[PDB]
Amino acid sequence: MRDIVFVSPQLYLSSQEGWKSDSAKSGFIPILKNDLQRFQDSLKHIVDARNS
Amino acid sequence: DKYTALIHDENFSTLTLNVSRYPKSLAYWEKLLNYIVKASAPICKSTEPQLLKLIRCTYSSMLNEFPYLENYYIDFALLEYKLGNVSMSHKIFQRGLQAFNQRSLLLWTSYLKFCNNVISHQKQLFKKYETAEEYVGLHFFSGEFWDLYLEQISSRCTSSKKYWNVLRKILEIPLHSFSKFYALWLQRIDDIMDLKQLSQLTSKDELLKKLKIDINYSGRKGPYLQDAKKKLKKITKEMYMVVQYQVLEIYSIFESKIYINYYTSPETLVSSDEIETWIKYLDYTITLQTDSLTHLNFQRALLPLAHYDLVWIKYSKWLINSKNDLLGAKNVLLMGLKFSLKKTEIIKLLYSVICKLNEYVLLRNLLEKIESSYSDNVENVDDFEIFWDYLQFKTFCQNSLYSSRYSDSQSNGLLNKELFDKVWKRLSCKEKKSGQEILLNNLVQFYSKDTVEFVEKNIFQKIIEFGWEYYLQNGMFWNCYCRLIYFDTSRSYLDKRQYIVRKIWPQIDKKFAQSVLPSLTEFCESYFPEEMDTLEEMF
Amino acid sequence: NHMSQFIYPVQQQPSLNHFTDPNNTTVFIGGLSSLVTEDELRAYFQPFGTIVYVKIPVGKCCGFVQYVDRLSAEAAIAGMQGFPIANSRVRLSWGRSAKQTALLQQAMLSNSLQVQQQQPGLQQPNYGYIPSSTCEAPNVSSTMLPGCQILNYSNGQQVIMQGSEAVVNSTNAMLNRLEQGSNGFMF
Amino acid sequence: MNDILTDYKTFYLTHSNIVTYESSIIDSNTFDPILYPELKMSNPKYDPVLNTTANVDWHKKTEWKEAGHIGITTERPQISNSIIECNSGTLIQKPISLPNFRNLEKINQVKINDLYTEEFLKE
Amino acid sequence: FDIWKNLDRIRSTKKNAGQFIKGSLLILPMRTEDKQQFDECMDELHKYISKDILRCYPQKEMLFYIVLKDFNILDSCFVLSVLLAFQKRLWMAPSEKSYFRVPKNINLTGSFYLPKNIETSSIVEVGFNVVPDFQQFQVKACHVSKFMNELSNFFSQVEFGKCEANVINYFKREYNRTYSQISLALYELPLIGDGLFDIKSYISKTRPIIETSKAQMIKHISEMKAYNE
Amino acid sequence: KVFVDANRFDIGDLVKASSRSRDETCESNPFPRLNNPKKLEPPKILSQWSNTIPKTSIFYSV
């Protein structure tokens, strides 16, 4: 699509591959392309708990 | 255009980003959808494909988080209906019915209503109702389902032998509204006006045997048919005595109390009594031994408390011991592992079902999928039970996969570099990991020459040498260190009484001997009465 | 067109005895060995739920037990019917508490009225409590989510169960009981 | 009884291997040291009994009689040859046989062995 | 307990077991940790079944789909007894390594799938199945002699057909998806507390009512204490 | 969105020509049982055969 991207937090907080895909995949949530950084910033603390 | 004007709007960016931050909350999924429909308010074939494809992936991604939302499968078909592709409307009832495992009432009711209008083929449209009733026909509130099916026989079919055939079934089922179906039977029986029309009720033989009325009775029929009705109406009334007992039981005991029959969410909480009746209403339904009616009444009771595990356990327990189908019980927990939020009581049981079934390659793969969840640090978990259920089942495989490295064919159990390092890393936490001594008490269990010398040196000596404070003040530790030595089959009584009393007893500190003594006395008071004085003088 | 097709069914009450009270919890245990303490009897009926125990009368060969959930009681009746305690088959059924017994035994000699009083209601709906569940031993700031057991009953104080700390304290007392039980201290 | 079965499970999973296990399920009886203790946990008189005559003797047991209400051994009426298991697609072949009842007289007869009164209040 | 004597035994006493069933399709999913171990065994097993009747479809992300179609009853008795004995060998007798002679005191178990559209003891159909358009069955036979007899009495009764051309490609899209969901379910496990719930709004909504539901239990004990004493 | 039927998709445009709106979410009324809900109305019965009913209930209702 244009100006939209499909992301799922369950594959990202567990740090797995394919946590974003631009095609309409199943179980993913459509967020704006510009807001992928504002997506990643919010989950940083939980990724710090997963890391450490 | 209308699409791009919605992306550059502020409220879209905040409502989306909220959902990706807090997935399972639902009330943000609901606002993301309730807003995005109103922003495309004229939703006809007109509106642009970028706006429709986006409103299709909201729904289809939202039902992939909450598969038990009956209304949003209906509401997503009707949007695909109005937009005008009934191919894609069927496909998403099929995906809705399969979500509930074919046995939900609202879907099959609000599928068939729709399905009347678009099937336009006789034999196949009744095949939808035949397939429907074997799943959701005995549902206690199914009254309104049959009223559709009887509406579609009368309306459509010519013969009027199916209408009597179907209605003979509904008379034997304990529905909520059964009296609306006896009223329809009694409006027919009265309107029967010839003796040939009693053949459509029941066979020519069973009339003459069970009631003694004959259709070939040629004579003056008027009073004879007026007798036949009175004789035939009676055994309806005896059936109305049978069913009414079964209904008024189930209503007065169970169904009266259950105030909530729908899903809501993972944040909804059910009352305590409501759980209490669902647990009893399920045991009652097992007693009846009606398998269609049992599967349905678990599924019917599942969706209000689908998150607890309390019903996922029983529904697997029913299937495992009563119906004797263990492979089928494995599938329930796997389907239950997803919805429940405890996930621990299931996963303990679910390991055990796989073990009995002899599918070990699955379970070894499953243990890899739970260590990979924490990133190879199950050892470091806060909730002990996930670790301890992991560990004892992880142990059982590595006894089997690797051959033993000790004497007397003892499977080198908890003592292996792979597992013991996970345990030693667990012991090192000391104060925070919170499942210490229970892990420690199972290290005692070896009872042989080689393994006692191992666990002495590799844990019970190194715990003294590093000299952590927490473990030496807890008398449960010293008690376990004594019981490791005493039950060894290698030692005689002399050295076993020496090695403990001469070396182990003095290694404790005199300050710790306040709080250690109670648990350490209990070992002494039971196994060593002879040397109970030499304990007391030391402290 | 005066009368109607259908009415809601009206029905008579069954007079409220101890056997037909739907709130009742207390299980009567008849035909004991009378070679059995209360603390050994408590070890038969602990696992079925939480107990608010009432008594075992002296030398009568028949005591009685009382849970807090009704569901827990019916799991105990169907659990241990014709189950031998110290070589004597045990017959058990519904029966009243100690105070209501005295109100019966004053009436049975004087055959006056015998008017029962039902157990008090819990006043529904309590969202925390899951029925037929035990806090196995005694800071908690839980998530209060539906999967976990939020509230519970202590052996009479309403405690908040910690899901992690429950299984470690139940398995704590499990291994403690095997070493005391083997050497005759607990029974 | 829980205390052995919880502990023996942990002990069997720890010290035994699959080859030890696989030879111990002879399968005349459905008994398995992993799965049996979880099933036999709070149930004392649990018996793994597979039989076809358990289907034949049903409807005359105390579980069936004291079904929704425990203690009270009522005699529930029922239709002998119930049609409700069969599907409407398969009934249309031959006409349906009339309903044979049983136990139809005892709709109101509810019996209770008041075991509390006659053995405690009466001695 | 040797296969070729047991297969000749089922050739004689099965009453015409040579003919193949029209529109027949049997899918056995399995997973093996050792690829090099299995790959020789299937290669040994591809020696007799002729590549049209049986096919091995690997799904890589080990898991193999063993599809079996257009088969003779006597052919289907052969392949399952080879495969199910191989799957259990890795744990029991790893030193044996003789593909067709089954080691003694090994009870065969496993599960095979069939199309839902089939017209109908050791082999049993299941209740509550996962893959939508299919129906799986469970084997639990003790001996290898008895396993042939139940299987050759199963396929006499069942008679089925009209399966679509690429049904196998529908099974992979389902059977991968139903374990794609469980792997994602275990990854949710450590992060239930605020990884994805919004607990702060949730705590603000339940704390008022659990404070009352606590007060209805402490009120209840005293109200229960008055009853007993 | 399904039972109000002024505001479905299939029928919804037709009924507006000839309140309980579509905006409703699960924020309002979080816990249904808060003295709000009504018990389920009991199953109806035939007048003619109103005296086939068992006379007494099994348990004592309030």
UniProtKB/Swiss-Prot annotation, chain A:
Signal peptide: none annotated. It is found in: Cytoplasm; Nucleus. Component of the 18S U1 snRNP particle, a subcomplex of the spliceosome. Component of the U1 snRNP particle, which recognizes and binds the 5'-splice site of pre-mRNA. Together with other non-snRNP factors, U1 snRNP forms the spliceosomal commitment complex, that targets pre-mRNA to the splicing pathway. Present with 782 molecules/cell in log phase SD medium. Belongs to the SNU71 family. This is U1 small nuclear ribonucleoprotein component SNU71. It comes from Saccharomyces cerevisiae (strain ATCC 204508 / S288c). The chain holds residues 1 to 52 of 620 of the full protein.
From Swiss-Prot, chain D:
It is found in: Nucleus. Belongs to the PRP39 family. Function prior to stable branch point recognition by the U1 snRNP particle to facilitate or stabilize the U1 snRNP/5'-splice site interaction. Has a direct role in the assembly or function of a catalytically active spliceosome. Present with 4460 molecules/cell in log phase SD medium. This is Pre-mRNA-processing factor 39. It comes from Saccharomyces cerevisiae (strain ATCC 204508 / S288c). The gene is PRP39. The chain holds residues 505 to 627 of 629 of the full protein.
Curated annotation (Swiss-Prot), chain E:
It comes from the Eukaryota. It is found in: Nucleus. Changing residue 76 to F: Loss of function. Component of the 18S U1 snRNP particle, a subcomplex of the spliceosome. Interacts with the nuclear cap-binding complex CBC1-CBC2 (yCBC). Directly contacts intronic sequences of substrate pre-RNA. Component of the U1 snRNP particle, which recognizes and binds the 5'-splice site of pre-mRNA. Together with other non-snRNP factors, U1 snRNP forms the spliceosomal commitment complex, that targets pre-mRNA to the splicing pathway. Present with 361 molecules/cell in log phase SD medium. This is 56 kDa U1 small nuclear ribonucleoprotein component. The chain holds residues 45 to 293 of 492 of the full protein.
UniProtKB/Swiss-Prot annotation, chain F:
Component of the spliceosomal U1 snRNP, which is essential for recognition of the pre-mRNA 5' splice-site and the subsequent assembly of the spliceosome. YHC1/U1-C is directly involved in initial 5' splice-site recognition for both constitutive and regulated alternative splicing. The interaction with the 5' splice-site seems to precede base-pairing between the pre-mRNA and the U1 snRNA. Stimulates commitment or early (E) complex formation by stabilizing the base pairing of the 5' end of the U1 snRNA and the 5' splice-site region. It comes from the Eukaryota. U1 snRNP is composed of the 7 core Sm proteins SMB1, SMD1, SMD2, SMD3, SME1, SMX3 and SMX2 (Sm proteins B, D1, D2, D3, E, F and G, respectively) that assemble in a heptameric protein ring on the Sm site of the small nuclear RNA to form the core snRNP, and at least 10 U1 snRNP-specific proteins SNP1/U1-70K, MUD1/U1-A, YHC1/U1-C, LUC7, NAM8, PRP39, PRP40, PRP42, SNU56 and SNU71. YHC1/U1-C interacts with U1 snRNA and the 5' splice-site region of the pre-mRNA. Residues 19-43 are annotated as: Disordered. The chain holds residues 117 to 196 of 231 of the full protein. It is found in: Nucleus. This is U1 small nuclear ribonucleoprotein C. Present with 2140 molecules/cell in log phase SD medium. Belongs to the U1 small nuclear ribonucleoprotein C family.
